[PDB]
Coordinates of C-alpha atoms in Angstrom, one line a residue:
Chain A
X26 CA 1.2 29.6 35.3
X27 CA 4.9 28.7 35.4
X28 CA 7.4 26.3 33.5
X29 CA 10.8 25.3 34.0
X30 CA 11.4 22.1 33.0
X31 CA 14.9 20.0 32.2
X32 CA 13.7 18.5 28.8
X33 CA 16.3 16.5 27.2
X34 CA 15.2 14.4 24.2
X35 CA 17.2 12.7 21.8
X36 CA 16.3 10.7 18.6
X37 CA 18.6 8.0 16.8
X38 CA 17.1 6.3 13.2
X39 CA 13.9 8.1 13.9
X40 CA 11.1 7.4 11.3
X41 CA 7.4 9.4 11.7
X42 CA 5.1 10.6 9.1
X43 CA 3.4 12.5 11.7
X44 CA 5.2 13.9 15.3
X45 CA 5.1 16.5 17.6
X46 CA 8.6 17.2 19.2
X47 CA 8.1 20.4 21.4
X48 CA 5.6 21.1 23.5
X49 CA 2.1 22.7 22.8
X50 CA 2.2 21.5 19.2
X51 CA -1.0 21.1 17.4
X52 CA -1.8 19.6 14.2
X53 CA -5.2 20.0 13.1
X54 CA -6.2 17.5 10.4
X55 CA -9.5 18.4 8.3
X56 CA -10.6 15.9 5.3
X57 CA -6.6 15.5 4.1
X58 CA -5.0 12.5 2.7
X59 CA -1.4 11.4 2.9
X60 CA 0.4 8.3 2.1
X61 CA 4.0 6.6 2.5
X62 CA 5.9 4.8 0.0
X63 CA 9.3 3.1 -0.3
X64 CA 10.9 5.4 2.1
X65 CA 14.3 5.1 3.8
X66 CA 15.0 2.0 1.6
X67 CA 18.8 0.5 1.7
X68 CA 20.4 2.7 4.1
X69 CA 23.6 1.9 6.2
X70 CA 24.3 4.8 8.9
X71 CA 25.8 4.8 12.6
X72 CA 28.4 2.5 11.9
X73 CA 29.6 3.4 15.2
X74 CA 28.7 6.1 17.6
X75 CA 30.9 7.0 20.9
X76 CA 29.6 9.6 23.7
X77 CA 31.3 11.5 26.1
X78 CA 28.4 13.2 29.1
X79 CA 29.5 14.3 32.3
X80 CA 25.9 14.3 33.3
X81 CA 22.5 14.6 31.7
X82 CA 20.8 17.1 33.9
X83 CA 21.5 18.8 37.2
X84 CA 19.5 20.9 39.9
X85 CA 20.9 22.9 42.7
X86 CA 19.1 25.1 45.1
Chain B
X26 CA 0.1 25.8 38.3
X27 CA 4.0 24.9 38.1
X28 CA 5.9 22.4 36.1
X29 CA 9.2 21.9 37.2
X30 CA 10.7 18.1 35.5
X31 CA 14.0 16.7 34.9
X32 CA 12.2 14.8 31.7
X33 CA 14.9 12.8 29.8
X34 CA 13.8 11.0 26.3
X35 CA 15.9 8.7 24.1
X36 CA 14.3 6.7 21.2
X37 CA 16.8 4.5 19.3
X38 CA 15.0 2.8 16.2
X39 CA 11.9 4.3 16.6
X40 CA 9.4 4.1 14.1
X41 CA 5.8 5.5 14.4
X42 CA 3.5 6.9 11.4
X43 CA 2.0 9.0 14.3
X44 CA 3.6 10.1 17.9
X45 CA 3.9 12.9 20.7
X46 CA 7.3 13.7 22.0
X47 CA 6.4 16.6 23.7
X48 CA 4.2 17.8 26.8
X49 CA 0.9 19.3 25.4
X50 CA 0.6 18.3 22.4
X51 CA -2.4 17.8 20.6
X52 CA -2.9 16.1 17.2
X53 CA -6.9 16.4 15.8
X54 CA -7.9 14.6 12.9
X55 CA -11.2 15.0 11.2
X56 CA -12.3 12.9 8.1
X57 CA -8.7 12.3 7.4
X58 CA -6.4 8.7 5.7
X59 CA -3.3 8.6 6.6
X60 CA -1.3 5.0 5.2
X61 CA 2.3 3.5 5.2
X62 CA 3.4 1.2 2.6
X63 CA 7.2 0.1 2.7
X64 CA 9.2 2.7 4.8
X65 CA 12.3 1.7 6.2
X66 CA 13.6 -1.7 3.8
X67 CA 16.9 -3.5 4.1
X68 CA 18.5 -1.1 6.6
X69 CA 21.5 -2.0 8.6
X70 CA 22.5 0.7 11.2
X71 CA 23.9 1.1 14.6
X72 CA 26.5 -1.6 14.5
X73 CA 28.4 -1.1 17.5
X74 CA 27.2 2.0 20.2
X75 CA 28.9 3.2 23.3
X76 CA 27.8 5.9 26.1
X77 CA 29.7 7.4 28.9
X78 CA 27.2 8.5 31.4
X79 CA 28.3 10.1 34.9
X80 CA 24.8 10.1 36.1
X81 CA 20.9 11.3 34.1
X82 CA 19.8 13.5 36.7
X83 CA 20.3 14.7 40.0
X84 CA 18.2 17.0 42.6
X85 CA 20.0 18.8 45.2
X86 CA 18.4 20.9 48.0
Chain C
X14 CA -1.0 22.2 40.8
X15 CA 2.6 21.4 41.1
X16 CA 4.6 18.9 39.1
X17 CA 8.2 18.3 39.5
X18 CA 9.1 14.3 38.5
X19 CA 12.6 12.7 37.4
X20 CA 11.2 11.1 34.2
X21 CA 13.5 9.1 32.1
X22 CA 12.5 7.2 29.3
X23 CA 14.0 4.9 27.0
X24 CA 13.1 2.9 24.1
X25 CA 15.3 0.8 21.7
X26 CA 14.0 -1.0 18.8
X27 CA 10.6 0.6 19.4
X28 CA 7.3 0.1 16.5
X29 CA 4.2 2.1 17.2
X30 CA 1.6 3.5 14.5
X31 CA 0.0 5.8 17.3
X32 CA 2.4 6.9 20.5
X33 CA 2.3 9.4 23.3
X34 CA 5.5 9.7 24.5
X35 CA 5.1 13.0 26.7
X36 CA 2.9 14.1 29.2
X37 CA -0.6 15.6 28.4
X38 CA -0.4 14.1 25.1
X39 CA -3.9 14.4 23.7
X40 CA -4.8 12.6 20.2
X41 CA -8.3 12.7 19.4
X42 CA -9.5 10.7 15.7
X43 CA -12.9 11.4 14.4
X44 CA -13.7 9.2 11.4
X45 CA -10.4 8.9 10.2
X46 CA -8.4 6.1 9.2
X47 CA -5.1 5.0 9.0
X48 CA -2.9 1.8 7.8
X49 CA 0.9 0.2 8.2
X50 CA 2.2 -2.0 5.0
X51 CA 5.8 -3.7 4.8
X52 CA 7.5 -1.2 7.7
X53 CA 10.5 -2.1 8.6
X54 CA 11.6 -4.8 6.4
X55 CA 14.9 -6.5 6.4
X56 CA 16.4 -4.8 9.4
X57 CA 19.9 -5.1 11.1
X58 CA 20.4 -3.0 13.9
X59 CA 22.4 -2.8 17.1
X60 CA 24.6 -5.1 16.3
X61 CA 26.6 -4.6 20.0
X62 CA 25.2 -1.6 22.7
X63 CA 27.6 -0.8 25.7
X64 CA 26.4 1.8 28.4
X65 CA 28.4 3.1 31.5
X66 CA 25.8 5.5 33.5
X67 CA 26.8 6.2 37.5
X68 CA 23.1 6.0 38.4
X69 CA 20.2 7.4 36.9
X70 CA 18.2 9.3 39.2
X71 CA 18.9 10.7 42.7
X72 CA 17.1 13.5 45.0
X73 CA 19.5 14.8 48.4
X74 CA 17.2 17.1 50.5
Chain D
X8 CA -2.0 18.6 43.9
X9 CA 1.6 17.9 43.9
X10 CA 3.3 14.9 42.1
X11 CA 7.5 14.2 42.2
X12 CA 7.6 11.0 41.5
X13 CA 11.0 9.2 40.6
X14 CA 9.6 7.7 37.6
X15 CA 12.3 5.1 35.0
X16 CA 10.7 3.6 32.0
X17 CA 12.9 1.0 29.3
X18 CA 11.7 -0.5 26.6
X19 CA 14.1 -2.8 23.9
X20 CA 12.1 -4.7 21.5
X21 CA 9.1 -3.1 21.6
X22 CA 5.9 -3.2 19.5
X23 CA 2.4 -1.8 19.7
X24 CA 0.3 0.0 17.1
X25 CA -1.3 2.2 19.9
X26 CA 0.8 3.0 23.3
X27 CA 1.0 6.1 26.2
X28 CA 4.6 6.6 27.5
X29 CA 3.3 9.3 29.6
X30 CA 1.6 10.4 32.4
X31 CA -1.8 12.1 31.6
X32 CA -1.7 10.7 28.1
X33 CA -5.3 10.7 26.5
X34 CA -5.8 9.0 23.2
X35 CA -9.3 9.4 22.1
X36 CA -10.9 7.7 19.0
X37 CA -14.1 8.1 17.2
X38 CA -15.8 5.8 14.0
X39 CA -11.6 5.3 13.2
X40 CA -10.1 1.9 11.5
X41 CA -6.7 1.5 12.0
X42 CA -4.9 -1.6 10.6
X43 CA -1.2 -3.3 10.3
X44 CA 0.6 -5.5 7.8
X45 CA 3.8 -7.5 7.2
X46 CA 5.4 -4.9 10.0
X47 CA 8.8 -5.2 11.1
X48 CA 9.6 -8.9 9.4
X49 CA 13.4 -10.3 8.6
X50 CA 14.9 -8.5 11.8
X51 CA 18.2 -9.0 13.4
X52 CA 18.9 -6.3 16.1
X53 CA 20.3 -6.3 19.5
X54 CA 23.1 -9.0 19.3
X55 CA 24.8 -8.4 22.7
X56 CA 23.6 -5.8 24.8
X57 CA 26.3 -4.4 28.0
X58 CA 24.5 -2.0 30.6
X59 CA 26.7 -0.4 34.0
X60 CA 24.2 1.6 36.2
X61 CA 25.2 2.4 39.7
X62 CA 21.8 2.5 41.2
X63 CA 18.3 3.1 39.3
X64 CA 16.7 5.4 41.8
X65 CA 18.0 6.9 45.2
X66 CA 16.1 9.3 47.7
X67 CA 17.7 11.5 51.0
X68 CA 16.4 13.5 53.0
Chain E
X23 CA 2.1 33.2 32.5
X24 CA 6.0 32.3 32.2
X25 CA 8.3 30.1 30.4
X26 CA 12.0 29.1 31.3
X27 CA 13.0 26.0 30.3
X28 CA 16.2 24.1 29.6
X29 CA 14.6 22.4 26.6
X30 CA 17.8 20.0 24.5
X31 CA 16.7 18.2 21.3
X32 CA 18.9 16.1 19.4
X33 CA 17.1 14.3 16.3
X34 CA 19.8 12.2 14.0
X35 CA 19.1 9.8 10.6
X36 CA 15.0 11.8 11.7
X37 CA 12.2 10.8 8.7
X38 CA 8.9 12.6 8.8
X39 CA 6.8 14.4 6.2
X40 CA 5.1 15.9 9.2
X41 CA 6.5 17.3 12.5
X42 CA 6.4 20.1 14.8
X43 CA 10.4 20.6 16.3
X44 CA 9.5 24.1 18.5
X45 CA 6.6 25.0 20.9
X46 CA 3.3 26.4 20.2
X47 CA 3.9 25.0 16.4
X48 CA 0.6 24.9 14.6
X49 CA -0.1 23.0 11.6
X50 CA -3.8 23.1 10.0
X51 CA -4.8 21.2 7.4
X52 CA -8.2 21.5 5.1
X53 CA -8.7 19.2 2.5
X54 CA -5.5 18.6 1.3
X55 CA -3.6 16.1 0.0
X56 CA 0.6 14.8 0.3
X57 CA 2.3 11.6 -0.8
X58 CA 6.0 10.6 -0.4
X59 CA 7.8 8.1 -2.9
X60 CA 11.1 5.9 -3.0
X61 CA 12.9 9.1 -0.5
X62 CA 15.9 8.4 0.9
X63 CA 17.4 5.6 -1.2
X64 CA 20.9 3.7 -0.8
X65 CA 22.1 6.1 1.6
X66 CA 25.3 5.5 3.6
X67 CA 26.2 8.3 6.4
X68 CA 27.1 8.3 10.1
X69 CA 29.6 6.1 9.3
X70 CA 31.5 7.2 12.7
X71 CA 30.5 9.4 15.9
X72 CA 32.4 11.0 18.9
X73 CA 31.4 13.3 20.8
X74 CA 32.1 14.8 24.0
X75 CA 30.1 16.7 26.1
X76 CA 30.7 18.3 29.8
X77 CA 27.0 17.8 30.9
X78 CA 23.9 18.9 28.6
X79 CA 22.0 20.8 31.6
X80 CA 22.2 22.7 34.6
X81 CA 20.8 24.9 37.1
X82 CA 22.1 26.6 40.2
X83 CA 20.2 29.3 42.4
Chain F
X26 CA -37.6 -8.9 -26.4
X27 CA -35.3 -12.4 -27.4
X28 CA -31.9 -13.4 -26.9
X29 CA -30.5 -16.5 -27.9
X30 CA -27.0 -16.6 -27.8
X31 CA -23.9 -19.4 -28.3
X32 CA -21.7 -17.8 -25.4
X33 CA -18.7 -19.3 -24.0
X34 CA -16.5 -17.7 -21.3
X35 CA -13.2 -19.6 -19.9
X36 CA -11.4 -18.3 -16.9
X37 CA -8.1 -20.1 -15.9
X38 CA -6.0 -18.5 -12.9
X39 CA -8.7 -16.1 -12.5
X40 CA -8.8 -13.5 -9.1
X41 CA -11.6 -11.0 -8.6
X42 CA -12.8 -9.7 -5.3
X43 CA -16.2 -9.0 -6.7
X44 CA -17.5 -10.0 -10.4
X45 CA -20.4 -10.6 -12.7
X46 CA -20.4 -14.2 -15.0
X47 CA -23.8 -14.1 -16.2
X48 CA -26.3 -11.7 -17.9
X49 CA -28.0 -9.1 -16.1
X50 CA -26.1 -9.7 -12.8
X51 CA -26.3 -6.7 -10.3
X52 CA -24.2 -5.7 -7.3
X53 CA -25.7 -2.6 -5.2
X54 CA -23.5 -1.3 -2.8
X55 CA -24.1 1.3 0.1
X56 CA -22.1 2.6 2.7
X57 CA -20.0 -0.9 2.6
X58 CA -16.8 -2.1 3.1
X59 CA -14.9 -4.6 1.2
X60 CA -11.3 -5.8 1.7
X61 CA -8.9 -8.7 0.6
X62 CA -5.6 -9.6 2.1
X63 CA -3.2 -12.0 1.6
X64 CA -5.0 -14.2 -0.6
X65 CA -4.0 -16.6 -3.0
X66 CA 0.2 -17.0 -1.3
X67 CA 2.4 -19.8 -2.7
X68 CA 0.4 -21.6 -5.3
X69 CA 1.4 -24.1 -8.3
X70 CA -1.6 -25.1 -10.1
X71 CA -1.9 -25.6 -13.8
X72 CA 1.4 -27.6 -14.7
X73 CA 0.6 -29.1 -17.7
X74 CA -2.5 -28.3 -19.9
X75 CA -3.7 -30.3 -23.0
X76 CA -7.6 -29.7 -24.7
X77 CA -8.7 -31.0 -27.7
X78 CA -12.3 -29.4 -29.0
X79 CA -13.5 -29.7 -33.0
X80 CA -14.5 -26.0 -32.5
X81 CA -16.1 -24.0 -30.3
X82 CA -19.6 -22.4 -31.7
X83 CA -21.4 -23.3 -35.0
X84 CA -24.5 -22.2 -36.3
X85 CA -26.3 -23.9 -39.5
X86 CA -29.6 -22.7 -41.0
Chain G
X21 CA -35.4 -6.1 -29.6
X22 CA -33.2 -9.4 -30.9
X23 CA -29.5 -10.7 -29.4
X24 CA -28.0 -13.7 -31.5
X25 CA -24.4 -13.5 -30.5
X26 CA -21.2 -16.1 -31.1
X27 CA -19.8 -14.8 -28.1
X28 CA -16.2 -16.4 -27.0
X29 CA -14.6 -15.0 -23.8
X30 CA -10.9 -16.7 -22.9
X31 CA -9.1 -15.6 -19.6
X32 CA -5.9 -17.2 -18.4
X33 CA -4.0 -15.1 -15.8
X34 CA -6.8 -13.0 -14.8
X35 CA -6.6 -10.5 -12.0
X36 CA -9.3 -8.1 -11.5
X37 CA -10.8 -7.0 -8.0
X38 CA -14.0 -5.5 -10.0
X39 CA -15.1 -6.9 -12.9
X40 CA -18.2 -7.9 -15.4
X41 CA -17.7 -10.8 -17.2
X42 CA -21.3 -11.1 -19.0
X43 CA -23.7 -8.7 -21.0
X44 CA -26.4 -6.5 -18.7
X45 CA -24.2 -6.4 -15.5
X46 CA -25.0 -3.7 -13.3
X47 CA -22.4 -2.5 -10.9
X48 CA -23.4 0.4 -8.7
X49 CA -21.6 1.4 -5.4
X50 CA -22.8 4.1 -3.1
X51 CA -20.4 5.4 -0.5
X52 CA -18.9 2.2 -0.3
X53 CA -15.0 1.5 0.5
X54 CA -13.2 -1.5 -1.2
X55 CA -9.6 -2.6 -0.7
X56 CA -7.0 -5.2 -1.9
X57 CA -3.6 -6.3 -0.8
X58 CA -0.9 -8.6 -0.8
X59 CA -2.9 -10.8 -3.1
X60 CA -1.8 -13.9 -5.8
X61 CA 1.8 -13.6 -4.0
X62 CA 4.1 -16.4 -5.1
X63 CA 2.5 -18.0 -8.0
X64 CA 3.5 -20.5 -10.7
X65 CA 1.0 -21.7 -12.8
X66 CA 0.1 -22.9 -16.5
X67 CA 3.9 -24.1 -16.9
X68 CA 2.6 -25.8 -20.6
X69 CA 0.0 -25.5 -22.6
X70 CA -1.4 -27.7 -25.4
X71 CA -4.3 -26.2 -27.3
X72 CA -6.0 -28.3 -30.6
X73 CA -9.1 -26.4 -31.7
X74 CA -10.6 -26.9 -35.5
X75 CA -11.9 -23.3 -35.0
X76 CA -13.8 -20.9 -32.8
X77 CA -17.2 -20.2 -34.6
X78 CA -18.9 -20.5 -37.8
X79 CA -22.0 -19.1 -39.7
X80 CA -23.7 -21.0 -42.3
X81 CA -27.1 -20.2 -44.2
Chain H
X22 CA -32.4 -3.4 -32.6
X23 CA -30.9 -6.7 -33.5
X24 CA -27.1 -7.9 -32.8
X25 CA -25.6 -10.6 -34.3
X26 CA -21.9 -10.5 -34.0
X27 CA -18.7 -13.1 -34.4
X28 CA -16.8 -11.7 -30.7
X29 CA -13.5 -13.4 -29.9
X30 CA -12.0 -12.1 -26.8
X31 CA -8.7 -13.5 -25.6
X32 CA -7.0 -12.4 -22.3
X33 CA -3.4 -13.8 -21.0
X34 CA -1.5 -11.9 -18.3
X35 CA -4.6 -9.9 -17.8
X36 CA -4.5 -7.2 -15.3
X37 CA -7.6 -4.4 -14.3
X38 CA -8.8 -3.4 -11.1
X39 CA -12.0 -2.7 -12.8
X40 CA -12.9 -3.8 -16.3
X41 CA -15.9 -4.6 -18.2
X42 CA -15.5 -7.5 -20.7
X43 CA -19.2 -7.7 -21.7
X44 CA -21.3 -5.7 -23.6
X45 CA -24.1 -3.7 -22.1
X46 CA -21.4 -3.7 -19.0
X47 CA -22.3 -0.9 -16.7
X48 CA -20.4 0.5 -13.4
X49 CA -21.8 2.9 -11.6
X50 CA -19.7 4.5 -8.8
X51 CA -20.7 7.3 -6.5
X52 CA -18.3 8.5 -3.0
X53 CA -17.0 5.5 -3.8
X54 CA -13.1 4.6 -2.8
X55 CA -10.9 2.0 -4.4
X56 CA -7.4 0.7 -3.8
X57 CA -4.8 -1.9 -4.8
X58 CA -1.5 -2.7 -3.2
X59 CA 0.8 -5.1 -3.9
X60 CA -0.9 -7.4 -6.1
X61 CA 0.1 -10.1 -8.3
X62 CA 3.7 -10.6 -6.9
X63 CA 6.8 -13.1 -7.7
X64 CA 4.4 -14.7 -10.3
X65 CA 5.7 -17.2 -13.4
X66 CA 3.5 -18.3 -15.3
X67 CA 2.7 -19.5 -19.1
X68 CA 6.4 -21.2 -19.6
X69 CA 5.4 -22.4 -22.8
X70 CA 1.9 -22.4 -24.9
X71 CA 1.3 -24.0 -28.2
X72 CA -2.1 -23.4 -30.3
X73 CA -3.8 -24.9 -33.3
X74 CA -6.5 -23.1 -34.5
X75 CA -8.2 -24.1 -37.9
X76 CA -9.6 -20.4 -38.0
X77 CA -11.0 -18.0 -35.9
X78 CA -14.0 -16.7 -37.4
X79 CA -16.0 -17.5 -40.3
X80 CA -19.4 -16.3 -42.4
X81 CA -20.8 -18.0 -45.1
X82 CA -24.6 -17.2 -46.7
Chain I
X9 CA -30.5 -0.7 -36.0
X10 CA -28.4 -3.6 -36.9
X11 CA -24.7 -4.9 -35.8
X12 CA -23.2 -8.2 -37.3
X13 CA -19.1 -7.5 -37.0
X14 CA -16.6 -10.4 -37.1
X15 CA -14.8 -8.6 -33.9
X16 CA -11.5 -10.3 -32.4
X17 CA -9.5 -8.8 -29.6
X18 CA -6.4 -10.5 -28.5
X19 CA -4.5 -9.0 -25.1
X20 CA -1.1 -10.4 -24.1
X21 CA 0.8 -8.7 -20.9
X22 CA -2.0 -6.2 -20.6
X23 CA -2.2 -3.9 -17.4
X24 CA -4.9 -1.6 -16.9
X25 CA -6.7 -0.3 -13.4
X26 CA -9.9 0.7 -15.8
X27 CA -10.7 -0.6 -19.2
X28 CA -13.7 -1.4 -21.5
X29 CA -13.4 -4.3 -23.5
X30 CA -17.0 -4.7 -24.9
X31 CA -19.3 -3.1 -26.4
X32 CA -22.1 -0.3 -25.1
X33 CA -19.7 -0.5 -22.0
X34 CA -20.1 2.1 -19.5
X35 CA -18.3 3.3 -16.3
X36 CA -19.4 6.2 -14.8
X37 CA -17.9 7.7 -11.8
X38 CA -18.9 10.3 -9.3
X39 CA -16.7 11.9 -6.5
X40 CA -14.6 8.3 -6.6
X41 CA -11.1 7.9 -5.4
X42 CA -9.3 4.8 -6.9
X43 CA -5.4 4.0 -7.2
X44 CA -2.8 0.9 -7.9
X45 CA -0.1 0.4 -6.2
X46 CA 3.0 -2.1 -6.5
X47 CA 1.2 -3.8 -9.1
X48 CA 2.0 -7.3 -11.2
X49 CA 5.9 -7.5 -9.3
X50 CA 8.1 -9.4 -10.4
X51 CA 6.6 -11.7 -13.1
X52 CA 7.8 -13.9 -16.0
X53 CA 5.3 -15.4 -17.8
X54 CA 4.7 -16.3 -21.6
X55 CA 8.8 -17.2 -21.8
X56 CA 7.8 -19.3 -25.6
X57 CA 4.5 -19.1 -27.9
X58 CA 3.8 -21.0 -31.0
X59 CA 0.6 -19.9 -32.5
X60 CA -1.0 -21.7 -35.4
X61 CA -4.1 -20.6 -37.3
X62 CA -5.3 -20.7 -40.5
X63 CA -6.4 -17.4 -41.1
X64 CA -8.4 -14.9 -38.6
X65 CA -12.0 -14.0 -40.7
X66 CA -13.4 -14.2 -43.5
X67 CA -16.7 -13.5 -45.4
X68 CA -18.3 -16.0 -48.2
X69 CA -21.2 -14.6 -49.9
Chain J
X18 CA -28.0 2.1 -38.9
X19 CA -25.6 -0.7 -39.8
X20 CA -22.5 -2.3 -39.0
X21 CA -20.7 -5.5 -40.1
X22 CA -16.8 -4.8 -39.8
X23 CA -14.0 -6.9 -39.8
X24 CA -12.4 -5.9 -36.7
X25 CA -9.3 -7.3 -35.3
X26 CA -7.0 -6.0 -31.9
X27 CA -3.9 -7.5 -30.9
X28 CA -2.6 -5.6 -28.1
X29 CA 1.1 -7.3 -26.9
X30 CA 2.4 -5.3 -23.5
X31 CA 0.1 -3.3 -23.0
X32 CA -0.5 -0.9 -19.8
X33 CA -3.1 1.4 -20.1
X34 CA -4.8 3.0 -16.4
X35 CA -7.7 4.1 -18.5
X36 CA -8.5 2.3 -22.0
X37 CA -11.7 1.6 -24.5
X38 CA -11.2 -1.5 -26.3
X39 CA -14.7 -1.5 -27.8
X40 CA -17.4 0.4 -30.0
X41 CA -19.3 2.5 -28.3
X42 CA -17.8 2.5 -24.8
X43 CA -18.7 5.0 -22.8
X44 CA -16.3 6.5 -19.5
X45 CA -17.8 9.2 -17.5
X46 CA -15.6 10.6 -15.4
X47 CA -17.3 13.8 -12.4
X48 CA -14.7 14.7 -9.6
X49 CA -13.1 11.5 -9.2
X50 CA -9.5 10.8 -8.8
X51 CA -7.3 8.1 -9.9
X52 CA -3.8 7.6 -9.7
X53 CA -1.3 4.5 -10.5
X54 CA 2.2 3.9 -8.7
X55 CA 5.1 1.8 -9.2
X56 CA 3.1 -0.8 -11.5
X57 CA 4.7 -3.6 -13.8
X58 CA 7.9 -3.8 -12.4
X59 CA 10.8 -6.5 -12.7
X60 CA 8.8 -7.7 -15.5
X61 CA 10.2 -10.6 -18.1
X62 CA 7.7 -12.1 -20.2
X63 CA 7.3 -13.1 -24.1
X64 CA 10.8 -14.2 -24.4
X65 CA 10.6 -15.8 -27.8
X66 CA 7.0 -16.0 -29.8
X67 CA 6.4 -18.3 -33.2
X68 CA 2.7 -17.0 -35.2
X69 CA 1.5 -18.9 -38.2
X70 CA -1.7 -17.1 -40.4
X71 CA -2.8 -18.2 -43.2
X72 CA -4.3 -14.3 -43.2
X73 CA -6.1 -12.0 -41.4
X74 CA -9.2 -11.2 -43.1
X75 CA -11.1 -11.8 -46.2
X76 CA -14.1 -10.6 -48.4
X77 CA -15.7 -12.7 -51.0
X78 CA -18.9 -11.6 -52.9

């Protein structure tokens, strides 16, 4: 049992009641209730977004 | 058992009530209500983008 | 067992209630239930994208 | 059991209530109701869209 | 049973009542009950982004 | 056991998913599922209105 | 046991998913589900209204 | 037991998921669930009304 | 046991998910969930009234 | 046991989630639960009203 893994995760005007965003995450639900309303409303963001990557990932053996 | 992956993610304007972003993950539900009413109303975002990649990934042996 | 891929993922302007976006996602429902109302109302997004990537994936054995 | 696979997913515009963006996804359902309304109406995204790739995928050996 | 990984996670403008942002992140739920109203109203951020980055991952052996 | 009764019932723009208009009505329910959606959009009905009654109910012994 | 009623019911602009609009109505759910959205959306109705009643009830002996 | 009553019930802009507008009205409910969204919208109605009523009630022995 | 009441109820711009307006009403509820949302949006109704009556009861003997 | 009143209700606006608007009504209530959101909004009604009575009630002997 081994890991080594180049995870690379990115996430721009992300909306999710419910998520998992790393690994082996559990979410165990048992005779709940939720609910949503009215959310995010009237929003202006990321006018403008500029990036600069050499390179996402790399490997060398 | 070995996990060795140059993953790369990227969600822009994503929406989902429910998701998995990350090996593994497990999400159970028992006897549960889940609901969404309205989320994300008169939004304006990402008006211009730009990205400077060199290259996502690479494997050299 | 062995895994080693060059996974890249991308997703602009993306609408999903129920997702997996990573491997070995498991989402099990028992006598649950969910509901979407309004999402994503009035939207203006991405008004102009530009990307410069060199290539996105490469193996050299 | 050995997988390395060179493996380039994109998605603009997308839509679906229930989806796997991975490999060994499993999305298991039981005596569930799911349902969608009035989602993502009144859009205006992705007005010009510029992409520079090199080359998708490359292998050497 | 080992763990090494180069794991990146960038989350911005991120909505969810519910996540799980780090490995082996449990969250059981029995009976209860959550709501969200009206959150995140008339908001205006991100109005510009730079960044610069070398390259987000490496490895050399 | 007698009834005799001067009963009058008017309903103008009237919506009900389920009701009762007469005496002694019954409406068992078990393990059922009801739903409306959507119903009754864009109407104009009703403009102009004129009745002319002597009266409604008498009762002379 | 006797009922010798002047009953008048009027009902303009009525909206009711459950209701009972007569004497004696019986109403009985048992693990039943109801639901109701999105309903009587863009409505004009009773723009005037003209009414000439000599009177609604009367009791003479 | 005898009844004999002079009942004038008038309604306008009436709004009640559940109601009872008759006597003897009975509404039994058991693991029952009941919902309402959105109901009733951009509605104008009753511009103008105009009623003659000689009287509403009367007794005379 | 007797009843003979000159009763009159008049409701103008009334909102209300559970009501009783009758007599010997009942509503009984066990282990029941119910709830309104984004009700009666929007509206304008009863914009000019002219009521004329004589006079509401009365009792000759 | 008697009862001859002269009852009159005028009820103008009115929101109420949980009323009695008549004798003897009866509202049992066992480990329910009710709730009411974002109800009666952008409301304009009863701009101007004109009402004419003679009188009310009476009582002649």
């Amino acid at each position: 049992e081994v890991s080594a893994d180049q995870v690379a995760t990115v996430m721009w005007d992300y909306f999710s009641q419910l998520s998992n965003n790393a690994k082996e995450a559990v979410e165990h639900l048992q005779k709940s209730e939720l609910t949503q309303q009215l959310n995010a409303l009237f929003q202006d963001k990321l006018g403008e977004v500029n990036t600069y990557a050499g390179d996402l990932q790399k490997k060398l053996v």
